[PDB]
Amino acid sequence: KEAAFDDAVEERVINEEYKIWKKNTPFLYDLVMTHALEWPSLTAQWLPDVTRPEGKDFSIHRLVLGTHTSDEQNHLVIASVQLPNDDAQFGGFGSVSGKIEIEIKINHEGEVNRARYMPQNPCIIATKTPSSDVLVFDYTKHPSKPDPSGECNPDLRLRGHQKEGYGLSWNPNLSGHLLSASDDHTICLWDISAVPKEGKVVDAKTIFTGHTAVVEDVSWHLLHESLFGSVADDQKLMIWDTRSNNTSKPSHSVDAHTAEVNCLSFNPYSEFILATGSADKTVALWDLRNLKLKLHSFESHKDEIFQVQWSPHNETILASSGTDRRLNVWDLSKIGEEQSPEDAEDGPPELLFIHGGHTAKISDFSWNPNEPWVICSVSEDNIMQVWQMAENIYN
Amino acid sequence: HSTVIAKRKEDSGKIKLLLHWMPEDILPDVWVNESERHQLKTKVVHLSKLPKDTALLLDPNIYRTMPQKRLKR
């Protein structure tokens, strides 16, 4: 056929391009960290805690990683990283032996479809599985040395879903309040703030169904404990203010993009600014006051978009990931700024930066606390990269 | 290279004429006034300006999606 020949060609081209980008990096970033895992991951979460040992030049951070192996035993993992915390220090930068190390392994039944730590307790995390339920765990209650037998204490799994999903969000203000979203076209809500009789069985307190398509994502409010929206392939965003008691008719519902919506995120520093992400290769945004206005559109991704995340430490900085093996960085201030024809042929102004590391569909990324401008990225090629852009770009 | 396509006469003193271009690329057809005729028989444009979506039509090897048959979500 043709597609085979064509793909061989495309592969060789991508290889060349990565060669070039690597040769060119030194003038581009303030940090380059690459590390290969045995099995890839599908998760990313920076632990909100940081320790910095004295007499040295580096910090220490802990990361929350998942695992989707081929066939063998699945695991939940959290490992260690030694970020340089210094400006004058530079074997490589610090010790010679190692800068990354695994520390936490837990047996897991099925792959990991999602994993987030609870905001109130980082020792509490959730887990989406190939099954139709939810698992919760507290690592401090299990040894890092994994059970050579296999499956172990599910640590209060949940119930109320019928197909798998990917949505996951604790309520920031209210403990125990956690939302879910699966192929069931439904949103299931447990409240584990108080389950003395665990029994590994808790059913979702409330189950919402307003989308008639497979739901894609859900996120709580950032200030309100009784507010959150919804995302399905319906290309319909529905506003779900709880305490109104209707799992059928939400508070609001409009069409966001012409293609199915995938990812969704709210600005922390503001009250109203929403960040939306869809399959439309588009990026839109909205406000809680009025909604019948697609505020703006970022139009440079060349395939679907699967993740959006605002910046901590920065009010006007956002991030767009997808499948194009690229990663974008925008700017809300430079909206329509007259630029030179060469600045324009470079690109539109408001687009701020584009990451050029990975060579596969960028699975997932994350900001972190404890550090101003750094993000880790995970692809499907067993690849983990951490970087810091050069400084000169801003200011 | 453009070619006249449709010859529409406006009710006023105007006859807009439709143009299409030989490479059959991303570009759409265009309505031209007979006054602007003989001025745009052929057009040349820099690459950074072309219609993004339908730019790929030149080549599969422009850009692909390597899985090309997605198995997981």
Binding site: - | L47, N61, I62, Y63
Partner: peptide
């Protein structure tokens, strides 16, 4: 001196960047 050598050699790297030119441009 079969100058095709000088030709064939410097032939190879050219087309590559050439393609790459257009690609990156878009």
């Amino acid at each position: 001196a079969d100058h095709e050598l000088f030709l064939q050699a410097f032939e190879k790297p050219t087309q590559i960047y050439r393609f790459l030119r257009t690609r990156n441009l878009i």
